[PDB]
Each structure stands twice: as C-alpha cells, then as structure tokens.
Amino acid sequence: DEPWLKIGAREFRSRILVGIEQYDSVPLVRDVLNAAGADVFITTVDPDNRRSSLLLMDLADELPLDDFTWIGTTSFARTKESALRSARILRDSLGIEILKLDVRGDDNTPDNAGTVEAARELRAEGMELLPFILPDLATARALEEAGCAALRVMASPVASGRGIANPAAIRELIEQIGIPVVVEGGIGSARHVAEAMELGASATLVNTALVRAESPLLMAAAMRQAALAGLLSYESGPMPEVAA
Amino acid sequence: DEPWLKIGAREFRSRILVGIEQYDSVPLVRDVLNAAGADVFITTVDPDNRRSSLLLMDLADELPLDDFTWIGTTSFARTKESALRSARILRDSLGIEILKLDVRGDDNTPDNAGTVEAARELRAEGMELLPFILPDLATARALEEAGCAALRVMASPVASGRGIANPAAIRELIEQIGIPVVVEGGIGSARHVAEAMELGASATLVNTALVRAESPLLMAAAMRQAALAGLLSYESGPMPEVAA
Amino acid sequence: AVTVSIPTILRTHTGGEKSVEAKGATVLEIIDDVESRHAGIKARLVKEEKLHRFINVYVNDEDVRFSGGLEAEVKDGDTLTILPAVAGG
Amino acid sequence: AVTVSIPTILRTHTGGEKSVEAKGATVLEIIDDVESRHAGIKARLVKEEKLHRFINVYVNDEDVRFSGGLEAEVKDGDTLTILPAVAGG
C-alpha cells in the first residue's frame, strides 16, 4: 500500500479511521485500533462534559501513542465559536497541527456554512484541516481552495447505520475534488466501506459500527479488509450496471 | 479459514467461485483463477454450440487442473431434458460426481420447478448437486430434503451487474436453510460480494464481473478480499440499521 | 455417406464448415477420411491410438465408448458428432 | 471563595459533585486546598511538581500555562476549570 495523504512529515496509510470517544475500556480501545490497523489517534477536550470519554493519561500508559499521528477534533462543540476555542486549546496544550474540524449544532449534523467560516480562520493561522461537510459541491470547492488537506463527507446520519444515503452525489463530488475524500457518518458494516471506496473514497471513518457490533474486534478486522477490497475493486474499473 | 462445504473427499475452501466459459485466452483463465483464489474448476459440454469456450485439452496443458475440484455444469442447456443428458455425459466421460445443476429456458433464468424435477432424477443415481434457483422457500426446502449439498440462489439477472435485487428474501431463505447457500447472478463488484456475505451466504459465484472489469485480475483479487471481509463482518454481528 | 458434425471451436480445420461428408465402417475410418480432406483435425481427436480423454464422439447420439471406441461400427447414413469437454460457466 | 469546576470523569474523587469551594492565591494552593477535602484528585492533576501534560487548568477561562502554571494568581471569586485531554470521536 501507499499513503493516501501526507501532511508535512505525517503519513496516513490506514484507510480506516477510528473514533474512540464512546469506549470506556482502555484495553478495548487499544485492541480495536489494532484490529482496524489504525495509524491515527483522535484527541479532544470536553468543556461542557457531553461525555465521559477516556483520559489521555490512562491511554498513554497502555497504548503506544507515539506510533500514531495525533489529530484534534472539535466534535463535542455545539457552536462555531466553541469549536474554534477547542481547536486552539488543542494547539496550545498538545501542539496539535492537524485538526478534524467539526461544526455541528444540536442536531449532530455538520453545518456547511459555519464550517467554511471556521476553516478560513484556522487556515489563516496555518492549521491543517480535515473538515466534515454534507455533500455540497460549492462547499467542497471553497474548502479545497482554502487549502484543506482532505474532506470528510457525510454518508448518512451519525449512529444511523444506514450506510450511504445519496451515493451519486458523493461520487459526483469526489470526481470534482482533487484532494482526498474520507466518507464518514452512518457507516454500519464492512459492505458500506467497500461501497464508499467504489465511489472513489480514499478512506472511511467509522465509529458507532465498532462500538455496537456484537464483536467490535471482528468488525474492526472486517472493515480493514473491506477498505482494501473496496480500493482494488474501484481500481479494477468495475462493469457498469445494466439498468432500464 | 475452514472449508464451507465437503462433498466426500472434496473440500471447498475458496468463498469465490469463478465461471470461465466467456474467456478465449488460456493464460488469462489461469491468471483469473489464481487471483480469485479459486479451488473449483467448472467443466461442461456444448451440444448446440452456444459458445466457443476453451477446450480442456488446451487448458490442461497450461493449468494445474489436479489442484482443483472438478464440477460439471449444465448451464448451456435450454431444456430440462438437455440438462440431464449433459449431466450424464459429464459423468460418463470425466467421472464428474458433483454437478452445478442449471435448468433455464431461453430467458437465461433458472426454472425452479424444472430444476426440482431434474434434481430428483439425478439424486436418485447418487449425483451430488448444487442447483440454481430463484429465492423460493418451498423450492429451497424440496432440494434440501432431496439431499442437495448446497443451493445457488439468484441475486439479480445474469450479466446485469445489478447486485442483489431482493436481499430480504435471500436473508429469509438462508436463515431457514441448513445447507450452504451460494449467491450468484448479477454480481457486479466487490461490494456486492460483501453484501452477499452479510446476508449469511457461504460463498459467491461470479462470472461476468471479472470478464468485463477493465482489469479482470484486480477485480478477482478484490472479490477474494471482499468475501473474507464480508464473512468477518457477518460474524461480528453488525449493528441493526436505525430507520423510520 | 456419413454426415459428420463439427463443433464451432474446431471449424478452423474444416474451412469453417459446420458439417462434412465421409465414408467408412469404423469411427477411425471416418476420422482418417476427414483428415485426408481437412489436415490437422485428427490430431485434436486422437492421442496414442485412442480417442482423446477430453473428446467425446457419438454415433446417432450413442457414446462410442460404450460400443468399441475407435472401432465402433458406422453404417452409411449415420450421423457422427464430435463433442469436446469445455470450460463451463 | 474560589469556585472550582470538576469534569465528570474526575467527580469520583469529589463525591460526585460537579463543583467545589476553595481558598488560595496560587493555582497550587487551590489544588492543595481541594486535596485536603477530596483525597486522590491532586495525583490526577500534577506530576513531579508540574501540571500533568494531559491536563489543562483555566482561571476565568484563561489558560494558566501562559500565566505562571502552578504559580498563576487566583483572586477571591475567580472560577477555576479543570479540562483534561480526552479520547475524541
């Protein structure tokens, strides 16, 4: 395999990213990241106490955190102002250079306009961004032009397990966007990963799917394999479907 | 991995089966079967000259045919009577004990009733059968009770690339049937394999998808990986989709 | 005469004709008689004085292996079909 | 007094209360004063006479690292927030 993204010295090789804010067991996190083949570790702060996600203190003891690229996220924030604040706390406190940028309201859905506003601000101070958006061509071009390193694009609602709601729109967007696109949101199983990759996705971000599989570890292993199968399939130029 | 089917001394390990009647290049067949990880070699006769599929003479020279389980097929036949005749020619001429039983009319679609009639006849002389059917519970029970070793069930029309047209019906059938179920027909890409396995399929049979991918070899490799990813996903107990 | 059906894949050797005429009493005479017109075909049908393991020959729809192989009887007016083992789908 | 905000994950040590009262002039005095009531918490906050690298402390929303660390000034009526680095989604 080859890296699908490079930001400075940091290489992203694993085609599955794994969000970890829902686990309450440090050994399980260690084991899921292992099974998924993850090389990205996702870190944040929770000013409003929305969850009780594990302390880096407790994770650092039991995981080889130096083997991962560290990225920040602002996904607990519920205002644009609060996301920017969290992004700048992650910079100052941990030296985070790479941010998984999330601006959602109380509906747990990316706010495209507000996200673009936050990206202009953070790019202006040299932060490297992976912003989350709904699949809007205009929005995706603005962020590309602002120098975002990759886009995250919503397949379906968070924790819905519905897979990819509007695949054609995601295909159309990936075709027009030069930078890598990560599909994320609502991914329920390995078949959804392979579907994401056959639309041209560079990678996939899963979260709830691993937390809520009967066997998190096996699903992690399955999605790792689905990502590579998905990629190969895409590159092989699959047959066009013969419809009406 | 473990075998997903055993007929006498013959073990089926590969979760992708590969039909080979459309290739006109012996090296390519050798290479596709390799890429797909196939362990089953599919053989027939063409009384009516429907195609110009490769001679076993020419294949035997360039492939290690002894490393494969040999099964017969009656898929060129267009009547029930002609299928039975071809099945009995394959027995007498090559000692084929295991038959991929196909009774279709001129619409290239399995004829459930006619297939059940042909299975009763062939089981009565000790032939081991993998019959192809549309997903009908009654039909699937009759063949199971007649001692068929596995069922092949149609996802979508042949060469359509449409994937799985009625997944719930295929799920429902696999739940009720004890013997292994192979999904087959209309499989267009690796994501369709993984979908098939997440419905509970033991294996998948692909044909047109490899013949018509820009890169047959890469698609073969992708489906091999999709089958294993698909299986793991299934076993991990994926999250139920949250719908309306 | 004996009308002999060629399968598509071997019609290369018979100048692309799906049928040929011939004369002979055994299967092997009918082969030799066709070779004389259409060189190369016999090589595809027999190997070491025996029918190729991956070739089947019928006389009016009866498999010749149950009836003499190369030495099976051919009357005048009989149809002789060549049916090779092939890659299946 | 100085009202101190505890994050959910550490409320184990403060008998499950999301806030405590305290007295002190530096950050470190405010910590020691809370330890005296609620043993165990200080261990989570400091390591080798320094704030844990994975812990952040704010005085009325100002990060204390830019202002003295443990030695940063605390007036009476100030709010002191503890904000640990956590696993993100």
B80 is catalytic: no
Residue extents of the structural domains in chain D = 1-89
Name residues 19-48 of chain D within 8 A of A (Cβ).
44
DSSP type of residue A115: H
Residues C54, B45: C-beta atoms closer than 8 Å: no
| Residues pairing with B18 in the sheet | B206
Active site residues of A: 100
- Interface partners of chain C (CB pairs < 8 Å, 3 or more) are B
Q: Is B128:B99 a contact under the CB 8 Å cutoff?
A: yes
What is the CB-side half-sphere exposure of residue B198 using CA atoms within 13 A?
Answer: 30
- CA A29, A10, A144, A117 dihedral sign is positive
Residue among C65, C66, C85 whose CB faces B45 most closely: C85
Method: X-ray
Other C-beta atoms closer than 10 Å to the C-beta of B144 total: 16
Query: Which residues, 6+ apart, have CB-to-CB distance to B79 below 8 Å?
Result: B103, B105
C-alpha to C-alpha distance for B14 and A17, rounded to whole angstroms: 29
Give the distance from residue C45's alpha carbon to the nearest chain B alpha carbon, in angstroms. 10
Identify the burial level of B98 via C-beta atoms within 10 angstroms of its C-beta, where 0-12 means exposed, 13-18 middle and 19 or more buried: buried
Matching CATH number, C1-89, of 3.40.50.2300, 3.10.20.30, 3.30.1490.100, 3.40.640.10: 3.10.20.30
* Closest alpha carbon within chain A to D62: A89
Binding residue numbers of B for Ca(2+): 22, 24, 46, 48, 58, 61-62, 174, 177-178
Whether B49 has its CB under 8 Å from any CB of chain C: the answer is: yes
Of A159, A191, A221, the CB nearest to B194: A191
Sort out which chain B residues have CB atoms less than 8 A from C44's CB and list them. Answer: 57
Q: How are beta strands B203-206 and A5-7 bridged, if at all?
A: unpaired
C86–B29 CB contact, under 8 Å: no
State how far the Cα of B35 lies from the Cα of C30, in Å rounded to an integer. 43
Q: A53 and D56: CB-CB below 8 Å?
A: no
CA distance to A110, B169, C29, per residue, from B152 (Å): 44, 14, 45
Q: For residue C82, which phi and psi values (nearest 5 degrees)?
A: -105, 125
**DSSP state, C66?**
G
Query: Which residue is associated with the tokens 């505890």?
Result: D6
CB contact under 8 A, A219 and B208: no
Catalytic residue among B10, B100, B104, B192: B100
Q: Which of D72, D4, D65 is nearest to A88 (CA)?
A: D65
- Give CA–CA dist B14/B1, Å, rounded: 9
SS3 B220: helix
Find tokens 């009918």 and name the residue: C30
Residue B123 identity (one-letter amino acid): R
Element (H, E) at D57: strand D55-59
Q: Does B55 contact chain C (CB < 8 Å)?
A: yes
Q: Which residues of B touch C56 (CB under 8 A)?
A: 45, 89, 93
Cβ atoms of B180 and B204 within 8 Å: the answer is: no
Do the Cβ atoms of A209 and B239 come within 8 Å?
A: yes
The token pair at B121 is: 């006849």
Q: Which chains touch B (3 or more CB pairs under 8 A)?
A: A, C
Residue B203 is encoded by which pair of tokens?
Answer: 């294996």
Contact flag B45-C84 (C-beta cutoff 8 Å): yes
Per the CB < 8 A criterion, the answer to whether A140 and A173 are in contact is yes
Write the single-letter amino acid at A60: A
In what helix (H) or strand (E) does residue B216 lie, and over which residues does it extend? helix B216-235
Amino acid residing at A183: V
> Cα separation of B151 and B52, whole Å?
28
Q: How far apart are CA D81 and CA D83, in angstroms?
A: 6
Q: Sign of the CA dihedral C17, C86, B129, B98? A: positive
Count other Cβ atoms within 10 Å, centred on residue B9. Answer: 7
Q: Which amino acid is at A131?
A: P
CA distances to A110, B152, C37 from A45, in Å? 19, 53, 89
Is residue B77 exposed (0-12), middle (13-18) or buried (19+ Cβ within 10 Å)?
A: buried
What is the C-alpha separation between D49 and B136, in angstroms, rounded? 74
Q: Residue B63: which of B46, B87, B38, B44 has the closest Cα?
A: B38
Provide the 10 A C-beta neighbour count for residue A68: 17
**β-bridge partners, A214:** none
Which residue, among A13, A184, B65, B165, has the nearest Cα to C54 in the 3D structure? B65
Q: Do the beta carbons of residue A55 and residue D54 sit within 8 Å?
A: yes
Cβ separation A56–D9 shorter than 8 A:
no
Residue A91 CB neighbour total at 10 angstroms? 17
Within a 13 Å sphere around the CA of C78, how many CA atoms are in the beta-carbon half? Answer: 21
Provide the token pair at C9: 């894949």
Q: What's the CA gap between A202 and A215, in Å, rounded?
A: 26
Contacts of A201 (CB under 8 A, 6+ apart): A170, A174, A181, A182, A183, A230
Domain B1-244, CATH class in plain words? alpha beta
* Residues whose CB falls within 8 Å of the CB of residue A108, separated by 6 or more in sequence, listed in order: A157, A158
**Searching chain A, which residue's CA lies closest to the CA of residue D6?**
A49
Spatial separation of the C-alpha atoms in residues B110 and A167, rounded to whole Å: 31
A in contact with C (at least 3 C-beta pairs within 8 A): no
Chain C residue with Cα closest to B184? C89
Distance in angstroms (rounded) separating the CA atoms of residues C72 and C80: 11
For chain A, which chains pass the contact test of at least 3 CB pairs under 8 Å?
B, D
Alpha helices of chain A — where are they, by DSSP H?
A: 26-36, 56-62, 80-94, 112-124, 137-145, 167-176, 190-198, 208-211, 216-235
Label the pairing between strands A16-18 and A203-206. parallel
- What residues in A contact D55, CB-CB < 8 Å? 57
CB contact under 8 A, B20 and C89: yes
How far is residue D8's CA from residue C45's CA, in Å, rounded to a whole number? 84
Nearest to A239 among B209, B217, B243 (CB): B209
- State yes or no: chains A and B have 3 or more CB pairs below 8 A: yes
Chains D and B, touching by 3 or more CB pairs within 8 angstroms: no
Q: Which residues pair with A193 in a beta bridge?
A: none
- Residue A34 and residue A1: Cα distance in Å, rounded? 17
Please tell me whether residue C71 adopts helix, strand or coil conformation: helix
Cα dihedral B126, B128, B134, B137 sign: positive
Beta-bridge partner residues of B11? B6
Q: Indicate the annotated binding residues of A for Ca(2+).
A: 22, 24, 46, 48, 58, 61-62, 174, 177-178
Nearest to D18 by CA among D34, D2, D6: D6
Q: Resolution for this model in angstroms, one decimal place?
A: 2.6
Q: Cα(A146)–Cα(A120) distance, rounded to whole angstroms?
A: 7
Taking each helix axis from N to C terminus, what angle separates B137-145 and B112-124, rounded to the nearest 10 degrees? 0
**CA–CA gap between residue B34 and residue C86 (Å, rounded):** 19
The contacts of residue A211 (CB under 8 Å, 6+ apart) are: A22, A23
**In the sheet where C19-22 sits, what is the strand order?**
C19-22, C2-5, C79-84, C55-59, C62-63
The answer to whether B57 contacts chain C (CB < 8 Å) is: yes
Residues 6+ apart with CB under 8 A from A42: A17, A18, A19, A20, A21, A71, A72, A73, A100, D87, D88, D89
Residue of chain A nearest B196, judged by CA positions: A191
Domain boundaries of chain A, sorted by first residue: 1-244
Give the three-class secondary structure for D80.
Answer: strand
Our CA angle for B32, B35, B41, nearest 5°, is 55
- D81, D57 Cβ separation under 8 angstroms: yes
Please check whether residue B147 is in contact with residue B177, taking contact to mean a CB–CB distance below 8 angstroms.
Answer: no
Interface touch A54/D86, C-beta < 8 Å: yes
SS3 assignment, position D18: coil
A42, amino acid identity: I
Tokens of C45: 């049908």
